[PDB]
């Protein structure tokens with residue numbers, strides 16, 4: 001349901 | 014070394 | 026006459042452990058005399074608070090199923106109700122200790138690792154742990170002698186469960202006697 | 203809303219630490235570090251803690267879904283198994299930290315599509331004989347779930363196709379060791 005791709009998550013570091 | 018129960022209980 | 030002053034060595038050196046709901050080593054012993062001196066200084070299992078265990082394990086075998094000497098093994102399991110706490114727990118546990126220290130299972134006493142009494146509000150447990158649940162004859166012989174040593178009538182059945190099955194899950198038992 | 207609301211994760215996650223104290227039992231060596239359920243809180247946690255490659259050998263991190271303990275005995279694990287990645291000492295330097303981060307990202311981002319529900323957690327073991335990273339899944343008999351997870355994980359790690367990874371059931375691992383237990387699946 002709540003899915004985040006790799007580049008999205010890595011944008012937040 | 015094996016001890017039967019009566020022998021062991023004799024020490025109680 | 027050496028019987029006058031020499032202690033009676035056990036076949037094995039044994040470690041008694043206590044566990045509450047932390048795991049403590051109580052004492053290690055290797056004679057009949059040191060066994061009783063230990064037994065006479067500690068609470069009877071029936072006087073333990075629910076959640077406590079005693080474990081008697083051969084020295085060098087940790088009282089945990091993951092130990093290399095237990096991981097492939099299992100336990101003969103005696104389950105007791107609250108009425109049996111009163112009438113059976115202490116005598117069954119002593120008898121179990123006697124079976125262990127007296128090497129009562131003949132050539133198959135080598136397969137014994139230890140024994141555990143669990144005192145619990147929902148039903149106390151006593152168990153003899155063995156090293157290898159694939160040793161069918163060993164487990165079976167130990168089972169049969171233990172049952173007769175506890176004076177359990179033929180009608181009653183006890184099960185042997187491998188530690189890996191208990192941990193990992195349709196019958197629990199791989200042997201019954 | 204995007205300006206001020208944290209980004210919620212599908213699941214709440216618990217990070218566990220294991221230290222090799224040889225005087226305590228395995229279970230007793232397990233420590234809960236923290237729980238989180240947002241992208242932002244994940245990063246706050248990640249940026250605060252040691253890289254795996256800086257851990258003392260004998261130590262572990264585990265990231266597990268909240269309600270699932272990082273041990274075989276948990277109901278969600280007892281019938282399950284792990285996709286295992288085994289690393290040599292050269293890989294500690296070059297691959298461990300990037301592989302572990304990527305594994306974290308696969309979990310929190312729900313990267314296994316339909317089968318992300320089969321995932322329980324992941325463990326990194328730092329060891330003198332070779333580090334390990336593993337994704338734990340719930341049911342060893344879910345062949346399609348297990349294969350999909352393995353194949354996506356392998357792709358995400360960027361492992362050359364020729365490098366085979368194995369899936370070991372916990373039941374099998376429990377009575378043997380990590381390098382004597384056989385593979386139920388490969389990818």
Ligand SMILES: C[n+]1cn([C@@H]2O[C@H](COP(=O)(O)OP(=O)(O)OP(=O)(O)O)[C@@H](O)[C@H]2O)c2cc(N)[nH]c(=O)c21
Nearest residue numbers: 091092228229262272273274275327329378379380381
């Ligand atoms: C994941 N795990 C590990 N262990 C214990 O810890 C021992 C080491 O396992 P582990 O840290 O996963 O792997 P290692 O590289 O240190 O050693 P290995 O040769 O046994 O693979 C293992 O053999 C068990 O005795 C466990 C004991 C449990 N009761 N439950 C577990 O989940 C569990």
